[PDB]
Amino acid sequence: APLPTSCNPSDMSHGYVTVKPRVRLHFVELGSGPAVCLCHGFPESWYSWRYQIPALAQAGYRVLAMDMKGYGESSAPPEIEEYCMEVLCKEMVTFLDKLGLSQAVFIGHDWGGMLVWYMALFYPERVRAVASLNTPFIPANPNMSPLESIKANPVFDYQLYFQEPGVAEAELEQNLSRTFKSLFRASDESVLSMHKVCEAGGLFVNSPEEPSLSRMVTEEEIQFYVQQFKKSGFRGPLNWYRNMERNWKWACKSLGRKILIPALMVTAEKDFVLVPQMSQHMEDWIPHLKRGHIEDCGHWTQMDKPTEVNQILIKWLDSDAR
Numbered sequence: 001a002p003l004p005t006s007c008n009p010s011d012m013s014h015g016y017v018t019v020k021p022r023v024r025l026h027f028v029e030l031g032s033g034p035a036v037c038l039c040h041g042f043p044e045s046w047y048s049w050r051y052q053i054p055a056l057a058q059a060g061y062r063v064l065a066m067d068m069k070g071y072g073e074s075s076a077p078p079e080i081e082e083y084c085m086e087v088l089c090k091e092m093v094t095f096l097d098k099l100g101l102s103q104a105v106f107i108g109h110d111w112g113g114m115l116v117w118y119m120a121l122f123y124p125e126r127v128r129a130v131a132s133l134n135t136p137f138i139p140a141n142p143n144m145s146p147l148e149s150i151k152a153n154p155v156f157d158y159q160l161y162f163q164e165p166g167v168a169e170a171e172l173e174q175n176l177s178r179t180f181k182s183l184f185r186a187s188d189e190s191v192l193s194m195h196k197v198c199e200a201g202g203l204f205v206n207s208p209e210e211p212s213l214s215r216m217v218t219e220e221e222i223q224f225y226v227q228q229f230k231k232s233g234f235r236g237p238l239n240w241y242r243n244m245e246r247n248w249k250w251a252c253k254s255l256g257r258k259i260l261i262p263a264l265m266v267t268a269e270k271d272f273v274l275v276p277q278m279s280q281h282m283e284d285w286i287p288h289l290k291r292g293h294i295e296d297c298g299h300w301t302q303m304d305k306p307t308e309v310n311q312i313l314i315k316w317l318d319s320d321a322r
């Protein structure tokens, strides 16, 4: 079952676009062909797509893999409201403008999946096609506060823990190697319960001080993440979670419009947070939706099942984005 080719950071083309005076976005770029913009989740990196970038370039695409705002070599302003979906999506539009791209295909995972859905919803003229790994498209519900909705799903308890600035930062920054080795695990290897984080008082309070390495990752890979998060830390990344009311109000401005462009939703059997069933009935909002499903795959889709991800994405790109 041999691993796809990966990426060596020093061997990549590194690009930088200043979207505003204080905000510069970094990306890596490989390949010729139609532009495909890969958008990672929390707390990840462009390098989360290391197994996809060569494969998609070989398949005849120009891949732009982002450091999202708050991450890596991209700017990480401290202000919470710099990380609301309205701001982040408008910055990605400006990014396309500065690159001289009329459209791109957007592929996202986790919080990057949420972003690419909103790009498709509000900026469809700039989105050739959209794919999400794990993250569903959920229509805005103007009758339920985001607070209500969170409290009504217990696996989302960690999200409240992430609200108060500084608290989760201290825990996640205390020992970066422990942070990433604890998080980046296959489902069966989990050392963390995302429930009752608040009563425990932290994500890792009941996890090993010296976790083993997951089968999914090497020490060298973990240390790449460590080095990246030494640049700006966890405040910007966590700020993505601290705009729930603002994001809800923005999402309500879609006045029940549909997403009419080609779309792909990929579910992961063993993601016990972003569960497959959350995607049910997306077809009601997205008439041209196609689906994929990956068995034996947890939250960290790209590194858990890279071969399967690559096969799904290339088949869909070739049929629906080109």
Ligand SMILES: Cc1ccc(S(=O)(=O)N2C[C@H]3CN(C(=O)NCc4ccc(Cl)cc4Cl)C[C@H]3C2)cc1
Pocket: 041, 042, 043, 110, 111, 114, 134, 135, 136, 137, 138, 183, 272, 273, 274, 299
């Ligand atoms: C309008 C709306 C649209 C989609 C959603 S969601 O799909 O429920 N989801 C998407 C975001 C990703 N996320 C998150 O916490 N990711 C990190 C993570 C996950 C799973 C594991 Cl195992 C470890 C880690 Cl660290 C929460 C955010 C909420 C909610 C509301």
